[PDB]
């Protein structure tokens, strides 16, 4: 019938030609229109193995978003190895749109429909499709935004070849809103989050981590250090690069005590000088646009790392993670794999 295979996919989207927004422009020139009536075929009685940590669709998605950003962003200066490149830097229109990934003739995409599938191993409920669901290429660290939710339980995704894992992806079954604003100094911003809603979800995440890690006490602590892009919740809002301090989000005492309810206000900064997530160096952008800058997003997942080097009798320590944007694509492509007919 079929075998595991890799091939060059193509992309589809609902992008609009009249729009100056850069994802639309890229998609208009790089993708075809979506299928109005997509087809899904259940594979009666098939058990298939998946491995989200060995999925060439992830590399392919990465190539796309790199190409997208490299065509779309206009930094004033680019510092890339050994060079300094200067260019015009007009402000752009920026808001990610869903992209579907589709297989060419002779191939199909298998999809895992098990509700508590963790991304690796056997799947009992399998269907075949021509295209993935629409996936927004949101680039962020620590918190996964505007993505999909787990259908049933909270899910912990991690490769299990070793206890020395890299990223641990938490997939939430309930989204939590994050309201980030630069009011109308000019680079000071803040993110507002409903504290009672967040601490409820984070307590559930904690109990799932406990379940996963031999029932030990779960402790959060801040990021070890390194680039601001990973020590902070980093993301792009309306073209502007935001850096938000999340220490208040990972507050162990709020799992009852006082002051844990009500609005959580994270301090944020807009930065012109960034380390490129593409890993190629640094870029400088122009000062923030005037007016009220605002992005409201779903938190749909959390990127974590687990401290490996300290004695653990009764506890495990986790820190917010991210920076490798392939983990972002993994959080959405985990249920898919390409096979050849």
């Amino acid at each position: 019938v079929w075998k595991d295979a890799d091939t060059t996919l193509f992309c589809a989207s609902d992008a609009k030609a009249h729009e100056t927004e850069v994802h639309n422009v890229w998609a208009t020139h790089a993708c075809v229109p979506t299928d109005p009536n997509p087809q899904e075929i259940h594979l009666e009685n098939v058990t298939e193995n998946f491995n989200m940590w060995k999925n060439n669709m992830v590399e392919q998605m990465q190539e796309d978003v790199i190409s997208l950003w490299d065509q779309s962003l206009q930094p004033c200066v680019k510092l890339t190895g050994g060079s300094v490149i200067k260019q015009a830097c007009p402000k752009i229109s920026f808001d990610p749109i869903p992209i579907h990934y589709c297989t060419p003739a002779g191939y199909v995409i298998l999809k895992c429909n098990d509700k508590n599938f963790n991304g690796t191993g056997p799947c009992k409920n399998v269907s075949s499709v021509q295209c993935t669901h629409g996936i927004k290429p949101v680039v962020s660290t620590q918190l996964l935004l505007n993505g999909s939710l787990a259908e049933e339980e909270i899910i912990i995704r991690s490769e299990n070849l070793t206890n020395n894992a890299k990223t641990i992806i938490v997939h939430l079954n309930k989204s939590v809103e994050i309201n980030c604003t630069r009011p109308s100094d000019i680079r000071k911003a803040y993110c507002e989050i409903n504290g009672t809603k967040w601490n409820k979800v984070l307590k559930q995440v904690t109990e799932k981590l406990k379940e996963h890690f031999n029932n030990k006490t779960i402790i959060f602590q801040p990021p070890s250090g390194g680039d601001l892009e990973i020590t902070m919740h980093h993301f792009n809002c309306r073209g502007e690069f935001f850096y938000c301090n999340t220490t208040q989000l990972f507050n162990n005492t709020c799992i009852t005590m006082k002051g844990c309810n009500g609005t959580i206000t994270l301090p944020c900064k807009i930065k012109q000088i960034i380390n490129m997530w593409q890993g190629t160096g640094q870029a400088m952008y122009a000062p923030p646009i005037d007016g009220k800058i605002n992005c409201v997003s779903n938190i749909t997942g959390i990127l974590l790392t687990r401290d490996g080097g300290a004695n653990n009798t009764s506890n495990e320590t986790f820190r917010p993670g991210g920076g490798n944007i392939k983990d972002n694509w993994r959080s959405e492509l985990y249920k898919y794999k390409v096979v050849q007919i």
Partner: antibody
Amino acid sequence: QVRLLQYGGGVKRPGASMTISCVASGYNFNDYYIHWVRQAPGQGLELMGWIDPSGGRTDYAGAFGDRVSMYRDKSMNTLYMDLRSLRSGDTAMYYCVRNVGTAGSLLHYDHWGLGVMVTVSS
Amino acid sequence: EIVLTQSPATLSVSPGERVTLSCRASQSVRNNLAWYRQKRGQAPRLLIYGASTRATGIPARFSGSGSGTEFTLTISSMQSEDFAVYYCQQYNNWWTFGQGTKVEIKR
């Protein structure tokens, strides 16, 4: 053609802090973690901690809790390790080592630097 | 805090002869075990990873095997360059090393 060239060896004074370093080449600097491993005379190899050069995340051995820092200059393919509050027990060979990984895992070591000798005394 | 025990600490073997080295873990490490060699004035060198896979450039006289908590490194026929110190390493939980086995020349 991987190479990890090391610097910073020599005599250090007790109570002081030292910085040693490692210059990497022959591969994509962003794609491999680097581990710092030391061997004290008459003792076994011991991992001090690792750094992921892509973003600078680190993870340290608890036995070196407060005293160690690892960081890097990406644009120079250069890795640094600080060790503070030096004592005589810190007299050791210090190695820069690159670590093989997968998408989600950290595995064995595939290239060691020649190492640097540190001697702590007054 | 996974402890690797390499005993005996010293092995005396005549050139051209067979040697088997032992590594015992205090706890299961799956097959996440590697072997390194260290000669005088040289950096440690990877020989074997994943318990039984030879690294690039390593001749076929080197062999690794093992399950659970007991692993071996065997050299089918000892060469001149083979007399050295050998370390096992697990990377199942953090990274830890055995204390080493020195293989010396028997005369």
